[PDB]
Amino acid sequence: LPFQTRSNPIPWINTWLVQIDSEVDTDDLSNFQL
Amino acid sequence: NLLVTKRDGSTERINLDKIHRVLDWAAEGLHNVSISQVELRSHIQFYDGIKTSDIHETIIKAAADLISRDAPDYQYLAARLAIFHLRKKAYGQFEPPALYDHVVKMVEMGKYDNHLLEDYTEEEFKQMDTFIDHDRDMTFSYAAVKQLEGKYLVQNRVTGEIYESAQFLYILVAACLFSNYPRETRLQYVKRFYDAVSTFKISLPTPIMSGVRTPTRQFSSCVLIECGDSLDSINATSSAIVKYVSQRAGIGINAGRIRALGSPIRGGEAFHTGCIPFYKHFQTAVKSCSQGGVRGGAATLFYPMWHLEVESLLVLKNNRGVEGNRVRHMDYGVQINKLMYTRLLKGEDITLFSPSDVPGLYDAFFADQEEFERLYTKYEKDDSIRKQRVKAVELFSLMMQERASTGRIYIQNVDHCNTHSPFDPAIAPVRQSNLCLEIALPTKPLNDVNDENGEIALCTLSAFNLGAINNLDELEELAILAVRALDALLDYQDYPIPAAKRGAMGRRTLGIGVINFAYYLAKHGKRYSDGSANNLTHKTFEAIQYYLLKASNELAKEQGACPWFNETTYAKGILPIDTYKKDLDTIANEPLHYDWEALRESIKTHGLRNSTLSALMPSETSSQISNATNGIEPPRGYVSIKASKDGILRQVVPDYEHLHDAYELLWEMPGNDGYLQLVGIMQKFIDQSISANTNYDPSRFPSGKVPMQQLLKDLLTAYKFGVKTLYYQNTRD
Ligand SMILES: Nc1ncnc2c1ncn2[C@H]1C[C@H](O)[C@@H](COP(=O)(O)OP(=O)(O)OP(=O)(O)O)O1
Numbered sequence: 001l002p003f004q005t006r007s008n009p010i011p012w013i014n015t016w017l018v019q020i021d022s023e024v025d026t027d028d029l030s031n032f033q034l
Numbered sequence: 035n036l037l038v039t040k041r042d043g044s045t046e047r048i049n050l051d052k053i054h055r056v057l058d059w060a061a062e063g064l065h066n067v068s069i070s071q072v073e074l075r076s077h078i079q080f081y082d083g084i085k086t087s088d089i090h091e092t093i094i095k096a097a098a099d100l101i102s103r104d105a106p107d108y109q110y111l112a113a114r115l116a117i118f119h120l121r122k123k124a125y126g127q128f129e130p131p132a133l134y135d136h137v138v139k140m141v142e143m144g145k146y147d148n149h150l151l152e153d154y155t156e157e158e159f160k161q162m163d164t165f166i167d168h169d170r171d172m173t174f175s176y177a178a179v180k181q182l183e184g185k186y187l188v189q190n191r192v193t194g195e196i197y198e199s200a201q202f203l204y205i206l207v208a209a210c211l212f213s214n215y216p217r218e219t220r221l222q223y224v225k226r227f228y229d230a231v232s233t234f235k236i237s238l239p240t241p242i243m244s245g246v247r248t249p250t251r252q253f254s255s256c257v258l259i260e261c262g263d264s265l266d267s268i269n270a271t272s273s274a275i276v277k278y279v280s281q282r283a284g285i286g287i288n289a290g291r292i293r294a295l296g297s298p299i300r301g302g303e304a305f306h307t308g309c310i311p312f313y314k315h316f317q318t319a320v321k322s323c324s325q326g327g328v329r330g331g332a333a334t335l336f337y338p339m340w341h342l343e344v345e346s347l348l349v350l351k352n353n354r355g356v357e358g359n360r361v362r363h364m365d366y367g368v369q370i371n372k373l374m375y376t377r378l379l380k381g382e383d384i385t386l387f388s389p390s391d392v393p394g395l396y397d398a399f400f401a402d403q404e405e406f407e408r409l410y411t412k413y414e415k416d417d418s419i420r421k422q423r424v425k426a427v428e429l430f431s432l433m434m435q436e437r438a439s440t441g442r443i444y445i446q447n448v449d450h451c452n453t454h455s456p457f458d459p460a461i462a463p464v465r466q467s468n469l470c471l472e473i474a475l476p477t478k479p480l481n482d483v484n485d486e487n488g489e490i491a492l493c494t495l496s497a498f499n500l501g502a503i504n505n506l507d508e509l510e511e512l513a514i515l516a517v518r519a520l521d522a523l524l525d526y527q528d529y530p531i532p533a534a535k536r537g538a539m540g541r542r543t544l545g546i547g548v549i550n551f552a553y554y555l556a557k558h559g560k561r562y563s564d565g566s567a568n569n570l571t572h573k574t575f576e577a578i579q580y581y582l583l584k585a586s587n588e589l590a591k592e593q594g595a596c597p598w599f600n601e602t603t604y605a606k607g608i609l610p611i612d613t614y615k616k617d618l619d620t621i622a623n624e625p626l627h628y629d630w631e632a633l634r635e636s637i638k639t640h641g642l643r644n645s646t647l648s649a650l651m652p653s654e655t656s657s658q659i660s661n662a663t664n665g666i667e668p669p670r671g672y673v674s675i676k677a678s679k680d681g682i683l684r685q686v687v688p689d690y691e692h693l694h695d696a697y698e699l700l701w702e703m704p705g706n707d708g709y710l711q712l713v714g715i716m717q718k719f720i721d722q723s724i725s726a727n728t729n730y731d732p733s734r735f736p737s738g739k740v741p742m743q744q745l746l747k748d749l750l751t752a753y754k755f756g757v758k759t760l761y762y763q764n765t766r767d
């Protein structure tokens with residue numbers, strides 16, 4: 001590489017180069033301790 | 035051939051160079067950024083005689099859109115362009131004028147308060163100008179600079195002309211706050227506090243970032259007002275709203291004391307017309323200064339779940355329903371206690387009473403838990419009291435329903451507020467939340483607009499930038515340097531209402547939260563779902579609270595403890611590390627680093643200059659300045675888009691070039707069991723309630739519907755860890 005590494009200076013050149021669930025269960029929540 | 039109109043008003047032929055030079059400048063030290071991009075993106079349309087100011091403004095909005103994940107730097111590029119543009123309208127040139135000349139001229143213009151000249155001398159201003167570092171305006175981001183430009187900077191509303199720089203803001207705001215300080219340490223604090231807000235170490239509310247050094251002494255972000263069950267109190271509460279709304283301050287109504295519909299008045303001379311009729315009167319009061327009738331003035335109304343008209347209040351924000359019984363311009367917060375959830379788990383019914391019919395039952399609800407379970411079950415068997423049976427499973431479903439559709443219906447666990455709060459549930463119990471739901475301060479009903487016995491809960495917000503400190507020990511300085519600034523503000527600002535001043539000077543409560551929490555966990559390589567930050571969150575906040583109290587403690591000896599303090603638990607030698615949810619010892623084992631037993635003895639003697647010192651609040655406007663993540667809320671995306679006021683602004687997360695993997699975008703979390711699990715740990719050190727909000731993605735559930743099973747699950751999960759309140763419920767769209 002003859003020139004220093006660089007980020008592209010013109011990225012624009014690349015543009016031209018291609019319902020709610022109601023479910024309830026008491027037992028499932030009854031196991032949850034407050 | 036074409037000409038341009040320079041700022042001064044001179045005209046010269048168009049020259050591309052002028053633009054090339056500028057863009058090439060702000061692009062210095064940046065990568066992946068191209069000058070040509072902005073120029074072409076801008077599609078700038080020259081036309082004979084074009085003002086140079088317009089050309090500058092067009093290129094700024096251009097490089098603004100560039101900001102992208104691939105090339106983030108752009109958001110320093112645009113920022114640099116914006117500041118350059120601001121320096122032109124403010125001083126006509128990039129090099130800012132002397133701090134002393136700048137204040138003098140402004141005072142004559144009526145921009146800054148004339149007290150600045152009566153408190154400080156010319157010889158001092160020149161001494162403060164040294165602390166100033168205008169080179170700190172480049173440390174800002176487009177998202178931040180854009181905010182200051184629109185609102186924060188002291189600028190003309192009619193003309194749109196700017197009058198000061200970002201630095202002059204911090205240097206002044208700190209100085210005014212320490213104006214009433216001793217000549218021996220007056221200038222001192224002005225420096226440290228300055229290099230604390232300009233360095234993004236501490237975030238300050240919008241009403242503060244704008245006002246101090248403005249003649250206006252109104253810096254109240256929001257006011258909590260407790261309305262009583264009287265016409266006199268209603269009108270007083272209504273008038274109290276019209277007062278603060280005109281000041282653009284959030285409102286927190288509790289009408290939850292108003293008797294239900296059908297309730298007899300004065301024995302029976304007349305029957306109550308209902309709650310809905312009054313609720314509307316409050317809305318217009320909050321919209322009284324809103325433009326159109328639509329937008330501005332935010333007010334959250336609260337009420338008990340066991341209320342008789344609860345079923346008619348949960349669907350208020352719902353369209354179906356002719357306005358006759360509707361309110362879509364106000365938020366709500368259903369208050370719930372242990373007993374309530376109990377009836378849900380057992381699938382048992384909930385009795386809907388009325389405040390008037392059940393004496394003491396209302397007060398029991400917050401101040402005492404056991405008395406409530408005794409009176410409630412008592413009035414249930416009593417048939418001489420109007421009531422209504424409703425399945426706890428149904429009521430809780432109707433709530434989460436309107437909460438999922440509107441996403442405004444908030445939840446408030448009054449039992450936790452009075453279970454683990456600085457305030458004594460017997461003398462000054464928590465029976466309210468501010469609009470955001472972060473504040474938890476006592477309130478009292480007013481008999482008039484100028485009632486003395488009344489108490490309008492007020493607060494001063496602030497936060498610590500977790501992504502600015504190296505260790506937790508650095509909070510020792512920020513704490514004392516923050517509590518003082520806020521405490522002094524309480525005396526610097528005025529109060530348009532007696533009740534407001536009463537509670538303000540009474541307990542002198544403050545609300546200091548945290549910001550950029552997402553980035554904090556990112557550095558330590560932590561997440562929310564997994565909960566690998568439970569210990570870290572415990573340690574971090576443990577200090578945040580320790581230093582705050584240790585700061586307000588030393589402040590107390592200097593100026594004395596708040597007048598009403600005996601009320602607070604801190605007086606009776608009680609610390610948050612005692613009344614915290616014992617169920618938190620199952621999600622964290624991080625021991626106390628700091629020797630509180632020491633602070634216990636210290637506060638048990640001198641007390642605290644303030645009743646409450648820690649608040650976590652949602653801060654998008656404030657955080658945007660420090661280019662940090664809003665409050666504790668995780669980033670919605672690597673490059674979240676915020677649209678304000680006129681156009682959306684792209685704000686890339688902090689340290690993205692090295693943190694891309696670390697961040698756990700909001701949408702990306704499995705559930706909330708991990709998030710809420712952290713909030714409960716934080717609350718363990720918060721004297722005030724975190725505005726934690728839930729999240730649900732229909733794309734993670736079957737049939738593309740969020741099941742009610744999960745909704746109630748998280749609700750109970752949060753309550754289990756001591757979660758006081760719940761804010762929004764963002765539903766991925
Ligand atoms: N003669 C010109 N032709 C085209 N663009 C110009 C011209 N002069 C200035 N500009 C551009 C450069 C900037 O991007 C933008 C704003 O210029 P700005 O510096 O803010 O005002 P100014 O013209 O009074 O100061 P300066 O003389 O240093 O350019 O307009």
Ligand SMILES: Nc1ncnc2c1ncn2[C@H]1C[C@H](O)[C@@H](COP(=O)(O)OP(=O)(O)OP(=O)(O)O)O1
Nearest residue numbers: 263264265266292293298299300301304305306307
């Ligand atoms: N004429 C009315 N029409 C509709 N609502 C009313 C009327 N009068 C009072 N209310 C409502 C307003 C309050 O919510 C509540 C009580 O008002 P309030 O003024 O305190 O009654 P009161 O002071 O005359 O006697 P009491 O409060 O002891 O029943 O009932």
Ligand SMILES: Nc1ncnc2c1ncn2[C@H]1C[C@H](O)[C@@H](COP(=O)(O)OP(=O)(O)O)O1
Nearest residue numbers: 239240255284331332495652653654655656
């Ligand atoms: N319409 C409004 N105008 C101004 N402030 C508002 C508002 N609605 C709510 N708020 C305030 C009240 C809250 O206490 C506060 C919480 O977050 P904040 O971080 O303090 O706001 P900000 O980002 O503006 O500093 O925002």
Ligand SMILES: [Mg+2]
Nearest residue numbers: 263264265300
């Ligand atoms: Mg009465």
